[PDB]
Design a protein around this ligand. Structure first.
Ligand code: NA
Ligand code: NA
Ligand code: NA
Ligand code: NA
Ligand code: NA
Lengths: 238, 241
């Protein structure tokens, strides 16, 4: 396993992304962006990127806040997140730049990429798909997805898998249905895997200790969603 | 590049590849003083690369800065004006990017991180002064026919560098009243500053392409170029002794 930091600046702020490649497999391979939960890049998302490398992918874990920062409370990151939610064009320009940074690594086959994300990271993955980036697939895990925009009609090129806790308060039934209606109008190849009795942050063991409501780890939902991701990637990268 | 080694050093800034050009004389061994070389507003091209190459011949480690990305150099000032006015309107972000360029130079193993300087031509001279005003630990800066930006009270006392401003006395992009305001800032703070002002000399006096721009206000002047470059060399010889 090779783990390499990849540094950029964004309006002068240093970002330190973490790129994983397993030398067990030989030659260029599909690239996967891994977007963390809103707290920022930490062990949760780094472990996901390391495992994707073990499965044969070149995985770029995204430092969303800069300086590899991971915060403890969503209050610490709320202003930065609301600023992105309030300027989706600027957010998307940053997301497309991360995609181009992944594509440019020598061991990444620039034609074969995907994006996964957890929580806010899943919102990022769908915004990047809606920008029209040439992703082969996206997978979201317990994501609070942003609402559809009519200007994005027909832009998604990826296959889409939404892994969802049926009781997650951050992705309520009516807004989720509005998103599925967008994907259906545009004939996007989409799947919803909805887990009974599961809420937000179900892939993160630290969710059981969070003081905010609606958070709990669920080992079953995590394993089943991770397997469905692997199956989608095996389809598009066969 | 002559006998100097030239190494591209790439950064990713705001989604763009920047391809800086680092010059060293490998017949000299060891860490040595580093110099940032900021080009005119048109972008990084042969004019600034030749100056970085000459600094390497003099014994320095010189990083020619790719200001626009992808090595881009513009012909028409109307095309660069929006990006430049944006930097002028957010001097904090501009300074953070300049600081990151300074840290890139300092991190090279052949650069003594404690002993650095910055030069710049036109807009690049404004860059050099903004980096000094940010409080960076530069030993010296030299500006050549630069449209320097006006002083900010928040920068009082922050310049650590010695300062040499090489100026065309009839440059219309750096008029006498705003220049005087900058010299008053430097004087309040007791910065070790010099002004070398050249009679009958206008903007872009170090760039032989200036003669073909068709523009009043732009003209190469070989005497002013040679005399300003020798004053720079003298300043660097003092601080890096
Ligand atoms: Na590549
Ligand atoms: Na697009
Ligand atoms: Na042009
Ligand atoms: Na160094
Ligand atoms: Na400072």
């Amino acid at each position: 396993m090779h783990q390499q930091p990849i540094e950029t600046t964004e309006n002068g702020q240093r970002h330190i992304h973490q790129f994983f490649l397993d030398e067990t497999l030989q030659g260029p391979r599909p690239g996967v962006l891994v977007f963390p939960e809103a707290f920022g890049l930490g062990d949760h998302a780094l472990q996901r990127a390391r495992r994707l490398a073990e499965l044969g992918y070149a995985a770029l874990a995204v430092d969303i806040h800069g300086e590899g920062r991971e915060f403890q409370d969503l209050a610490q990151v709320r202003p930065a997140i609301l600023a992105l939610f309030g300027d989706r064009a600027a957010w998307r320009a940053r997301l497309q730049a991360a995609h181009e940074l992944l594509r440019a690594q020598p061991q990444v086959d620039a034609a074969r990429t995907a994006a996964i994300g957890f929580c806010f990271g899943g919102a990022c993955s769908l915004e990047l798909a809606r920008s029209g980036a040439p992703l082969s697939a996206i997978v979201t895990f317990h994501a609070g997805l942003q609402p559809p925009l009519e200007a994005d009609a027909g832009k998604i090129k990826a296959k889409v898998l939404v892994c969802h806790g049926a009781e997650d308060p951050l992705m309520k039934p009516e807004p989720l249905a509005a998103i599925l209606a967008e994907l259906t109008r545009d004939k996007v190849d989409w799947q919803l895997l909805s887990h009974g009795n599961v809420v937000h942050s179900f892939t993160n063991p630290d969710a059981d200790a969070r003081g905010a409501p609606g958070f709990a780890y669920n080992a079953g939902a995590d394993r089943r969603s991770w397997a469905a991701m692997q199956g989608l990637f095996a389809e598009v990268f066969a």
